[PDB]
Amino acid sequence: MESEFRVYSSANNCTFEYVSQPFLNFKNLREFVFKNIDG
Amino acid sequence: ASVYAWNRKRISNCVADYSVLYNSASFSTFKCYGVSPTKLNDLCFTNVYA
Numbered sequence: 873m874e875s876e877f878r879v880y881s882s883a884n885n886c887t888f889e890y891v892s893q894p895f896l897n898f899k900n901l902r903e904f905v906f907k908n909i910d911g
Numbered sequence: 912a913s914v915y916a917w918n919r920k921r922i923s924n925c926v927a928d929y930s931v932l933y934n935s936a937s938f939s940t941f942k943c944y945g946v947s948p949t950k951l952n953d954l955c956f957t958n959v960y961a
């Protein structure tokens with residue numbers, strides 16, 4: 873059971889929020905590419 | 912809200928249909944400054960402060 877979230881202490885001025893469908897021996901291989909081009 | 916504590920709602924990441932508001936008969940003032948109501952439904956903005 874997931875019952876521990878300790879990643880931030882505050883959230884003051886939000887510009888953008890987006891809730892989506894979930895993206896997700898070692899059995900799974902997950903490749904991701906993150907790019908910042910022209911905003 | 913009261914005018915001293917006016918509510919501000921940030922509107923982002925959606926489709927804004929302004930013709931529903933403009934063609935409503937329930938509004939007495941619809942005075943737009945800096946933009947015309949006819950091209951509001953065409954233009955696109957980063958954020959809307961209500």
Ligand SMILES: *[C@@H]1O[C@H](CO)[C@@H](O)[C@H](O)[C@H]1NC(C)=O
Pocket residue numbers: 884885
């Ligand atoms: C950002 O947050 C601080 C404190 O939370 C506030 O004083 C400031 O006015 C905010 N700025 C904007 C642009 O929202």
